[PDB]
Amino acid sequence: LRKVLISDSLDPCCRKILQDGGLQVVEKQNLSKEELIAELQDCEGLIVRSATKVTADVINAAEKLQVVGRAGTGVDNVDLEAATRKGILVMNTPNGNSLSAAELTCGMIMCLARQIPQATASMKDGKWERKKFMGTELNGKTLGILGLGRIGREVATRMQSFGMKTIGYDPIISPEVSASFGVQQLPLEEIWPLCDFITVHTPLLPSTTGLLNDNTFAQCKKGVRVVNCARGGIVDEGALLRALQSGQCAGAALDVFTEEPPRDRALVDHENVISCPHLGASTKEAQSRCGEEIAVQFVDMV
Amino acid sequence: LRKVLISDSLDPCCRKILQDGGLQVVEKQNLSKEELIAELQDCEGLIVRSATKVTADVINAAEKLQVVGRAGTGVDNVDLEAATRKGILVMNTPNGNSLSAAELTCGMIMCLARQIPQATASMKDGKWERKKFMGTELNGKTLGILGLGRIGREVATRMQSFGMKTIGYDPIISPEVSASFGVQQLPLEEIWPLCDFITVHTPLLPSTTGLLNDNTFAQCKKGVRVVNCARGGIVDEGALLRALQSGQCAGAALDVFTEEPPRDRALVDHENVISCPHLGASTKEAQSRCGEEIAVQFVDMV
Numbered sequence: 244l245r246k247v248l249i250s251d252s253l254d255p256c257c258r259k260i261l262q263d264g265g266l267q268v269v270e271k272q273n274l275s276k277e278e279l280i281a282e283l284q285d286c287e288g289l290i291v292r293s294a295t296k297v298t299a300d301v302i303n304a305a306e307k308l309q310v311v312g313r314a315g316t317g318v319d320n321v322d323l324e325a326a327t328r329k330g331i332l333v334m335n336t337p338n339g340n341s342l343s344a345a346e347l348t349c350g351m352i353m354c355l356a357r358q359i360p361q362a363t364a365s366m367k368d369g370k371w372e373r374k375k376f377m378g379t380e381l382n383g384k385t386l387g388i389l390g391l392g393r394i395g396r397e398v399a400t401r402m403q404s405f406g407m408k409t410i411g412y413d414p415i416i417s418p419e420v421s422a423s424f425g426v427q428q429l430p431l432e433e434i435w436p437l438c439d440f441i442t443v444h445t446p447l448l449p450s451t452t453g454l455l456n457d458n459t460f461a462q463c464k465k466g467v468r469v470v471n472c473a474r475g476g477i478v479d480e481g482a483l484l485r486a487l488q489s490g491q492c493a494g495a496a497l498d499v500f501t502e503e504p505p506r507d508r509a510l511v512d513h514e515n516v517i518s519c520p521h522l523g524a525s526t527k528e529a530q531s532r533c534g535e536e537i538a539v540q541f542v543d544m545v
Numbered sequence: 546l547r548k549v550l551i552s553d554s555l556d557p558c559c560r561k562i563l564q565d566g567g568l569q570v571v572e573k574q575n576l577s578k579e580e581l582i583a584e585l586q587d588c589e590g591l592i593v594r595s596a597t598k599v600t601a602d603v604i605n606a607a608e609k610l611q612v613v614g615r616a617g618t619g620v621d622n623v624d625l626e627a628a629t630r631k632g633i634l635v636m637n638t639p640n641g642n643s644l645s646a647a648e649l650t651c652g653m654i655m656c657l658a659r660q661i662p663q664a665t666a667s668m669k670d671g672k673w674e675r676k677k678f679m680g681t682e683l684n685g686k687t688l689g690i691l692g693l694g695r696i697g698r699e700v701a702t703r704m705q706s707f708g709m710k711t712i713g714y715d716p717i718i719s720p721e722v723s724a725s726f727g728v729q730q731l732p733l734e735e736i737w738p739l740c741d742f743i744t745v746h747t748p749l750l751p752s753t754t755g756l757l758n759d760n761t762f763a764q765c766k767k768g769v770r771v772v773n774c775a776r777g778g779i780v781d782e783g784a785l786l787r788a789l790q791s792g793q794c795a796g797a798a799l800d801v802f803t804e805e806p807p808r809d810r811a812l813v814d815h816e817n818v819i820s821c822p823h824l825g826a827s828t829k830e831a832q833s834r835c836g837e838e839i840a841v842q843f844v845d846m847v
């Protein structure tokens with residue numbers, strides 16, 4: 244039985260089910276550079292959240308090893324050429340967060356539709372302006388969804404109920420299967436001029452790094468509103484800021500950013516932009532089930 | 546009757562349909578309190594919504610007018626007893642807002658869940674507070690809709706897509722027709738202990754003035770989250786203000802108020818409270834979509 248690290252915030256259900264096979268770990272990560280000489284030197288695995296941006300060296304500094312794995316979304320903190328030193332894989336939990344990012348993005352569609360945070364943020368500033376925050380309805384406006392995996396198909400089944408026409412594009416996914424979850428499929432060329440909203444749930448990829456750039460925004464007709472609760476970057480943040488600045492983008496909702504604590508501050512400060520600190524998988528719920536699924540697909544191989 | 550005024554901001558959507566059914570009218574709004582008796586001592590009809598409410602007596606000093614009309618749910622601007630017994634009665638717009646208030650309410654449910662405005666206001670203040678807004682899922686949580694009808698049944702079907710078990714209570718509305726949009730019906734007695742969220746759009750009535758008070762709060766779950774996008778009062782603003790304090794109601798979303806611009810500011814400021822200045826009905830989809838009906842039930846009199 245080898246014993247590992249809770250190298251980040253994770254619901255203690257995680258550790259209890261992690262151990263009732265024979266395998267615990269220490270209750271912390273409050274740290275950063277020079278106290279993480281402690282969790283080094285031993286261990287075989289690691290169980291994080293991601294605030295543990297494991298450096299180029301601190302996966303090679305625990306050379307007691309074979310694999311690691313984190314409860315949630317991707318790994319936005321591991322250089323894995325600098326991760327896979329010997330026999331490494333990293334297990335992730337791509338199914339557990341599936342439902343709650345869908346919840347987050349539909350909430351962001353509705354806010355993009357109305358401007359709910361802007362209106363209360365200055366109501367709390369003490370102002371009764373029943374004239375500036377006049378929104379648009381969702382039913383009958385046209386939504387476009389790029390990529391169509393778990394999350395997007397859940398976003399879509401949730402949002403065609405509001406009366407929205409759902410189109411999209413996934414290269415692999417048949418037009419037949421998109422139709423069989425009510426999202427029409429297109430080549431991107433026509434997906435732009437047809438849309439009142441655009442959300443994406445695309446992974447960060449070269450095909451998709453900045454897959455909404457100055458051209459796509461030049462093809463969507465005026466005032467479209469982009470939501471991004473996927474990976475930071477899939478919307479060209481400068482190009483997005485430009486479309487925002489003049490009329491091409493009525494508003495935009497952004498859960499992720501190219502630089503994760505974004506030190507670029509032009510977008511969030513913008514009037515038509517609504518924000519969140521990567522709350523995509525942030526429910527007591529979602530972290531519960533990804534901690535379980537990591538700590539079972541971990542505690543039962545080898 | 547073939548002379549009219551819209552004493553309010555009006556999408557000419559109304560006036561155009563008004564005209565060749567047989568009725569000419571003038572385009573002002575800006576108006577004082579006691580001066581549209583000049584504009585309306587020589588014409589007969591009137592269409593208001595909010596601005597410069599039709600008084601109790603601007604029925605007694607405008608010795609012409611005989612029918613009136615409001616773009617919106619209910620009438621929060623006409624003294625209806627001082628209308629009825631001089632032989633004036635009111636056509637209003639009960640159909641236009643149902644869909645855009647239903648949508649707004651579902652947005653406010655989502656924000657209560659995942660704290661989208663609360664998270665954005667500190668993104669805009671430049672703080673990455675990724676653990677204060679660890680929200681809740683909708684899927685599996687149990688929703689309550691007090692009073693059903695237009696907005697209630699549309700909120701119910703819209704919110705069933707998220708996986709919520711949605712119950713409610715309307716006395717008139719059939720238990721058999723209760724089901725026809727998937728809301729079970731129970732008396733409040735049992736609907737309290739059952740709820741993670743509760744929505745309201747019930748009319749203002751002594752039957753319902755302060756229908757959520759310190760008593761109701763003593764029976765539902767704890768940390769329950771209520772939205773009220775109906776009339777100001779149906780939730781006791783003082784009683785709710787206290788409920789927040791105890792964790793008995795974790796969060797709350799309010800579109801309307803007992804006052805108007807409330808000189809009371811205790812609730813609006815609460816970190817776990819989200820707001821908007823009566824935006825329930827404010828998209829010109831819906832607003833002009835009311836402009837159609839008011840000036841057709843006018844031109845379906847002549």
Ligand SMILES: COC(=O)C[C@](O)(CCCC(C)(C)O)C(=O)O[C@@H]1C(OC)=C[C@]23CCCN2CCc2cc4c(cc2[C@H]13)OCO4
Nearest residue numbers: 337388389390391392393394395396413414443444445446
């Ligand atoms: C551009 O090519 C694609 O979009 C196909 C693909 O998006 C990606 C293939 C699956 C993996 C993640 C293994 O690459 C997919 O099938 O789903 C991914 C998938 O596995 C099904 C995981 C992802 C990535 C972020 C969100 N999420 C869950 C499912 C989902 C839903 C989406 C979405 C992406 C995802 C991915 O955009 C449209 O709505």
Ligand SMILES: COC(=O)C[C@](O)(CCCC(C)(C)O)C(=O)O[C@@H]1C(OC)=C[C@]23CCCN2CCc2cc4c(cc2[C@H]13)OCO4
Nearest residue numbers: 618690691692693694695696697715716745746747748753
């Ligand atoms: C306390 O008992 C009730 O709630 C009954 C009643 O809410 C009002 C009875 C219907 C009338 C207005 C004709 O009395 C109703 O049936 O709906 C009203 C109704 O007719 C269906 C008109 C209303 C009034 C304001 C909003 N709107 C649309 C429908 C609706 C939806 C609701 C709601 C109220 C309304 C009303 O509570 C939460 O979900």
